[PDB]
Amino acid sequence: DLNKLVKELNDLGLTDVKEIVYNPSYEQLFEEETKPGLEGFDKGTLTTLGAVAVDTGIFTGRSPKDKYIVCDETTKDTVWWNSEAAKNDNKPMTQETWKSLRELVAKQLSGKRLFVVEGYCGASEKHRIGVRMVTEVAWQAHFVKNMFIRPTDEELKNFKADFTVLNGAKCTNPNWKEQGLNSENFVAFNITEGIQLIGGTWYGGEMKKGMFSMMNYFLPLKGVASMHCSANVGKDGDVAIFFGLSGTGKTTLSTDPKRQLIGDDEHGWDESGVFNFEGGCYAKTINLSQENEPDIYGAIRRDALLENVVVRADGSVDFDDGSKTENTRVSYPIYHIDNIVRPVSKAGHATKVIFLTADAFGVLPPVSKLTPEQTEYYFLSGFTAKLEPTPTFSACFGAAFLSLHPIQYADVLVERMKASGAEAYLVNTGWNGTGKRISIKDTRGIIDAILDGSIEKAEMGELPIFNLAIPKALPGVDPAILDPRDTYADKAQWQVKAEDLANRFVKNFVKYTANPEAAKLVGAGPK
Ligand code: NA
Numbered sequence: 001d002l003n004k005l006v007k008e009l010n011d012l013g014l015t016d017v018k019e020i021v022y023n024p025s026y027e028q029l030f031e032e033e034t035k036p037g038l039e040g041f042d043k044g045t046l047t048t049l050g051a052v053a054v055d056t057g058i059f060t061g062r063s064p065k066d067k068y069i070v071c072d073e074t075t076k077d078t079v080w081w082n083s084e085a086a087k088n089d090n091k092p093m094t095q096e097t098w099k100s101l102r103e104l105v106a107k108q109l110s111g112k113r114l115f116v117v118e119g120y121c122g123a124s125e126k127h128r129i130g131v132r133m134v135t136e137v138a139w140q141a142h143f144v145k146n147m148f149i150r151p152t153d154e155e156l157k158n159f160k161a162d163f164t165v166l167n168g169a170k171c172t173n174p175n176w177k178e179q180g181l182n183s184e185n186f187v188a189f190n191i192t193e194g195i196q197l198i199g200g201t202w203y204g205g206e207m208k209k210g211m212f213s214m215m216n217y218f219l220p221l222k223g224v225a226s227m228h229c230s231a232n233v234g235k236d237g238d239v240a241i242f243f244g245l246s247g248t249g250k251t252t253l254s255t256d257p258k259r260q261l262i263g264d265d266e267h268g269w270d271e272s273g274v275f276n277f278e279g280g281c282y283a284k285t286i287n288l289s290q291e292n293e294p295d296i297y298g299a300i301r302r303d304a305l306l307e308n309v310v311v312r313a314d315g316s317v318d319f320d321d322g323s324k325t326e327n328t329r330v331s332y333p334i335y336h337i338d339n340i341v342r343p344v345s346k347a348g349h350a351t352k353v354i355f356l357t358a359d360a361f362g363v364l365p366p367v368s369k370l371t372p373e374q375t376e377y378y379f380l381s382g383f384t385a386k387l388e389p390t391p392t393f394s395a396c397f398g399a400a401f402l403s404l405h406p407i408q409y410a411d412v413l414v415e416r417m418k419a420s421g422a423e424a425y426l427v428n429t430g431w432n433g434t435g436k437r438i439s440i441k442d443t444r445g446i447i448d449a450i451l452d453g454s455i456e457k458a459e460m461g462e463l464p465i466f467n468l469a470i471p472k473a474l475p476g477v478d479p480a481i482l483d484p485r486d487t488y489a490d491k492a493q494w495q496v497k498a499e500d501l502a503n504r505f506v507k508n509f510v511k512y513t514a515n516p517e518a519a520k521l522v523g524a525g526p527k
Helices: 002-012 026-033 095-108 138-147 153-157 205-221 294-299 372-381 406-420 440-452 491-514 518-524
Strands: 020-022 052-054 067-070 091-093 114-121 129-135 163-168 186-190 195-199 225-228 230-234 239-243 259-263 266-270 273-276 280-284 305-307 329-333 350-357 367-369 383-386 390-393 423-428 460-463 468-471
Touching: 002 020, 002 114, 026 052, 026 138, 052 138, 095 163, 095 186, 095 195, 114 138, 114 205, 129 138, 129 205, 138 205, 138 280, 138 305, 138 329, 163 205, 186 205, 195 205, 205 225, 205 266, 205 406, 225 239, 225 406, 239 273, 259 266, 259 273, 266 406, 280 294, 294 329, 350 372, 350 383, 350 406, 350 440, 367 440, 372 406, 372 423, 372 491, 372 518, 390 491, 406 518, 423 440, 491 518
Parallel strands: 020 114, 052 305, 067 091, 067 186, 129 163, 163 195, 239 350, 350 423
Antiparallel strands: 114 129, 186 195, 225 266, 230 239, 230 259, 266 273, 280 329, 305 329, 367 423, 367 468, 383 390, 460 468
8 A cells, every 4th residue: 555655654754755666576676777867876787697786886885883773761771882891883872863863864755756665574474574665766675675585465465664764875964063973974773663764875785784783683682593694404404504704614615505595694593493584695796706606696687786896898797896895796686596495584493503713823623512601602702813813803793783782692592502402513614733724625524524413423522722622533524634733743833822812712702791691601711
């Protein structure tokens, strides 16, 4: 009912609403994106791959410094607010400033032709958020049609919008200084009202990650895990989830011809199992090649939406050109990948949990079986490194999207694992004592041993300092690399580097000891 929709938009403050393009088909979106007369960043270009490409302007990535959550009676004592104790992007916003911003955005979307897309964040009927996004730019509607679950005709008849995203990319906030904000741009959330406002930035990710942040607020409070991970399922129905920061092999190791993909980035884990929050994938395309990333490359066709890629004069795409940004992307509905779970992106309870890390310090074992306490410790640590070794720590493998304290995500994850008897493993896909990277042959052998349970049959030893349980041998894996000390000429070399890494983990974790519940976890961390 377009009549009902317009009244609800008026309620939000949008006036003089002209034509509304509600839930357009992919064909309509293509026509809208290539419409004669589009100017600026609204303009789409049909590439030779058949996919339309658009540019996002000055913002080619998220703007965490411009992210705010309204502080009110609902959020004062529930949100994990940025503090001296532990810095994060959850910056409070007054109700007065929120109102001003809402009016600003409402004004920007008034007296115009609008696109409205309604979809779901969450494949679980019990724990999903119906999202309604309003925009004046067709490709932004396309991004949402790709990234959220597309409702059935039946669902669209009784669709309830639990959260509304008002995309006012074209407007900027003139009173930001007076208001004490970061800039004239803004990505603000009002949890009580159920609204996300976007201003100044055109980057599509703000819509995807904004809703992920909201799921990260509502779900854990209901005992449901909300995770930044990929997930897949074996032919027999066995489910595994993978965590890992960029460069840890997450995408490659969770891509297996024999296991259908549930999702590649955001999942929930409730009483029924693991479910994707998304209806598509938002992949990085820099240096993309058909040879290396056949699944992703193959997905770039009509209905995919390329972002910030360089298009040559003949319409072809130079995927190696990062002139606009190194963060070139492409979004596409999930069925552009063949090896996926259908008809709905969800499966049973996970029984294997894998934490990947590229340990540039060459200290961690290629694989360790974690205790429940260590599972929480390494989940809060969210560690990886790159080469002198430089570490990166990101709580729960996605600190930027945590609306609650890290411990709250760890608690629900381990609760779900305990019920299904799931085992967690820390897997180092990085380097060892040779100074070289662990072979992918061994890493693939390790992932196989984890999934087929052979690691559970192995004789176990224990690595000192970290007190990690490690297998002495595994089918298809070089037993000479299982203990990280064996790849060094002298174990004393490992010992020195281990004390160093242990120190970095401990120093990183100190901020969590300011949280009462998490404080005791230092006992499960190194030394
Ligand atoms: Na399309």
